[PDB]
Design a protein around this ligand. Structure first.
Ligand SMILES: *[C@@H]1O[C@H](CO)[C@@H](O[C@@H]2O[C@H](CO)[C@@H](O[C@H]3O[C@H](CO[C@H]4O[C@H](CO)[C@@H](O)[C@H](O)[C@@H]4O)[C@@H](O)[C@H](O[C@H]4O[C@H](CO)[C@@H](O)[C@H](O)[C@@H]4O)[C@@H]3O)[C@H](O)[C@H]2NC(C)=O)[C@H](O)[C@H]1NC(C)=O
Ligand SMILES: *[C@@H]1O[C@H](CO)[C@@H](O[C@@H]2O[C@H](CO)[C@@H](O[C@@H]3O[C@H](CO[C@H]4O[C@H](CO)[C@@H](O)[C@H](O)[C@@H]4O)[C@@H](O)[C@H](O)[C@@H]3O)[C@H](O)[C@H]2NC(C)=O)[C@H](O)[C@H]1NC(C)=O
Ligand SMILES: *[C@@H]1O[C@H](CO)[C@@H](O[C@@H]2O[C@H](CO)[C@@H](O[C@@H]3O[C@H](CO)[C@@H](O)[C@H](O)[C@@H]3O)[C@H](O)[C@H]2NC(C)=O)[C@H](O)[C@H]1NC(C)=O
Ligand SMILES: *[C@@H]1O[C@H](CO)[C@@H](O[C@@H]2O[C@H](CO)[C@@H](O)[C@H](O)[C@H]2NC(C)=O)[C@H](O)[C@H]1NC(C)=O
Lengths: 71, 48
């Protein structure tokens, strides 16, 4: 799983992988890396339960769009 | 199960169990949150 803002994100369908520097979520039978967003993943619980969770940011698709108008 | 379809591909056993849970229709967060309890139950069953 992934720790983003005190929450644990799990992949909807796929698995979290990293090439060495960045993290992606890909379908389990074909390497198709994709940016981890709130759509690929779903939240559940908090950060202090899962064994092996890792810090990483999660990109929210709606956030940049709204900030554009506000800017 | 990958070694049954082709070349064996490694995967952490916790994640494999998460896949199995997804298979039986239970979200993997259940396993990732009850991992210790599930491991204890499995070991106890093997001992029994
Ligand atoms: C794991 O995957 C990561 C995927 O992001 C890898 O990080 C990425 O590495 C690539 C390759 O270095 C970077 O791509 C190019 O980045 C700069 C400029 O960045 C712009 O283009 C990127 C295209 O990938 C976008 O992703 C960026 O957002 C940004 O818009 C380029 O200048 C580099 O060179 C290219 O351009 C010059 C000038 O035209 C050419 O001369 C070159 O030949 C080439 O065409 C990179 O190609 C990318 O920025 C980077 N992304 C991130 C988020 O870090 C990561 O390296 C990889 N890790 C391992 C261990 O494999
Ligand atoms: C779901 O099923 C699980 C297995 O039945 C439940 O897990 C059990 O929950 C109890 C309470 O947390 C655990 O007991 C805790 O830890 C130890 C265990 O030793 C005692 O065991 C029994 C009670 O289980 C008790 O009667 C004995 O006298 C022992 O003293 C003790 O310190 C406490 O009892 C403490 O409560 C069990 O150990 C635990 N079993 C396993 C295999 O982990 C679980 O609670 C059920 N409910 C949920 C929401 O998961
Ligand atoms: C995921 O991200 C957070 C940071 O945003 C990491 O939590 C941080 O972990 C360090 C310890 O490694 C904490 O530093 C120290 O913690 C002790 C704990 O009592 C505290 O007393 C000290 O004052 C000091 O802060 C840090 O507090 C903590 N930060 C937060 C906000 O909790 C976490 O480790 C990252 N996960 C992984 C696997 O790296
Ligand atoms: C990786 O496996 C281990 C247990 O070996 C956990 O961290 C390791 O702990 C030992 C003892 O400190 C070290 O020798 C290793 O360097 C540690 N990292 C390893 C083995 O990769 C750790 O919890 C496990 N990582 C995950 C994501 O589950």
């Amino acid at each position: 799983a992934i720790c983003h803002d005190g929450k644990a994100h799990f992949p909807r369908e796929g698995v979290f992988v990293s090439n060495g520097t960045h993290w992606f979520v890909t379908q389990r039978n074909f390497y198709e890396p994709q940016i981890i967003t709130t759509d690929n993943t779903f939240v559940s619980g908090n950060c202090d339960v899962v064994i092996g969770i890792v810090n990483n940011t999660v990109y929210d698709p709606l956030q940049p769009e709204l900030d554009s108008f506000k800017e | 199960w990958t070694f049954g379809a082709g070349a064996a591909l490694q995967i952490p056993f916790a994640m494999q169990m998460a896949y199995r849970f997804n298979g039986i229709g239970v979200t993997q967060n259940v396993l990732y949150e009850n991992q210790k309890l599930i491991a204890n139950q499995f070991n106890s069953a093997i001992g029994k």
